[PDB]
Design a protein around this ligand. Structure first.
Ligand SMILES: N#Cc1c(-c2ccc3ccn(Cc4cccnc4)c3c2)n[nH]c1N
Ligand SMILES: N#Cc1c(-c2ccc3ccn(Cc4cccnc4)c3c2)n[nH]c1N
Lengths: 212, 200
């Protein structure tokens, strides 16, 4: 049973997640994903969520007072607050496994230059906070990262949704001049396992030498 | 100017998407898309036949064929810069255990093909990776190291937490140095590999 709350100024971006969820898992009370428009917690008629950065620089910073009110309402002491950020700790499969047994994830999606740091720092005094990055590239905001995190985590929750994997093949045995490796059709399953292991070793050397 | 075509059995997942156009295609338009793996194993493999017909129609020899896969080369900001000046990206999104390897191999005989991974975690398919790649690339299209440090805005005091006084000082050199120190401190703590140190 996991609850995920996502807070964002672009609620529509999280539409795929809602679609990804099988009815059986929702009906069994195994998972609930709710998406919240950050502007519900704005203070002014202009529904302001950002303001100029102290110390100067380009871009804007999301307002602490708005985020503070949102997280005050949504989070409890048991919440794991997830904050995507290009400056975060790396989100890995190990992370996904750890988070898959949490009762309550709240994902705070920023835009612009990010969220005033006091939001996370204040929250960390009353709950667990994790600033994470999904990879070494730059996005426009946290929403695509939330999609990735939600999928990676929920597929590890029962019935909700190292070396590199080698190539896979299926029918037909010959296609556009290319035959499936004959070893795979040999019925020698110890040999097939060794062939697959060597394919994986070769691919890891070529594509991810860092893993070795 | 860039054209992006995305091919998927779940076109609805791509909904979050003048100098750039993005089109989404249902792979099933070219047909059962999957079958059991040769050599055994759990799960299913996407058939090369359907993919071949799809890519035949959508791709040219100019196309950069992008194939998300957990076994890919890393997609990084460098990749995003490289791809930002391409005329035509086609992103082939797999499901199940992935796509028959011959699809990429066949395609590489007539176009440039890039198998890439957006990170060291496992997804159920290529679609979320496609969304990440598109976002990272499009923001670099003409006409559109170290970890960044913390940012602050008004009010200068909030819940008894102050904005670092240097940021209020108006001293550009001191502000630049404090920010450099914050960034290097964050990088050592969170991504020591970026500075050539062992990971945790
Ligand atoms: N996780 C993760 C990320 C993000 C990401 C996450 C949240 C935000 C909120 C704003 N931006 C834009 C921005 C651009 C430049 C500097 N600072 C901020 C975000 C980028 N980018 N790349 C990742 N792997
Ligand atoms: N880029 C990227 C990815 C993917 C990814 C991309 C395409 C597909 C097509 C199917 N699956 C599920 C699957 C699961 C396990 C083994 N093999 C395949 C995909 C996962 N996962 N993690 C990433 N960083």
């Amino acid at each position: 049973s996991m609850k995920i709350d996502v807070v964002t100024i672009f609620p529509e971006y999280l539409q795929p997640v809602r679609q990804s969820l099988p009815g059986k898992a929702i009906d069994a009370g195994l998972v609930d994903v709710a998406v919240h428009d950050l502007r519900r917690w704005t203070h002014d008629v202009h529904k302001s969520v950002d303001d100029s950065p102290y110390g100067g620089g380009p871009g804007m910073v999301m307002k602490p007072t708005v985020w503070g009110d949102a997280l005050d309402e949504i989070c409890t002491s048991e919440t794991l607050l997830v904050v995507p950020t290009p400056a975060g700790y790396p989100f890995t499969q190990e992370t996904a496994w750890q988070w898959s047994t949490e009762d309550h994830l709240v994902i705070a999606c920023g835009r612009y230059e990010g969220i005033d740091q006091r939001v996370a720092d204040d929250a960390a005094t009353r709950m667990r906070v994790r600033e994470v990055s999904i990879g070494d590239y730059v996005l426009n905001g946290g929403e695509a990262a939330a999609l990735v995190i939600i999928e990676a985590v929920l597929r590890l929750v029962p019935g909700v949704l190292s070396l590199l994997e080698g190539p896979s093949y299926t029918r037909p045995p010959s296609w556009r001049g290319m035959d499936v490796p004959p070893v795979l059709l040999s019925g020698d399953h110890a040999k097939i396992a060794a062939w697959r292991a060597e394919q994986s070793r070769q691919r890891t050397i070529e594509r991810r030498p860092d893993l070795l």
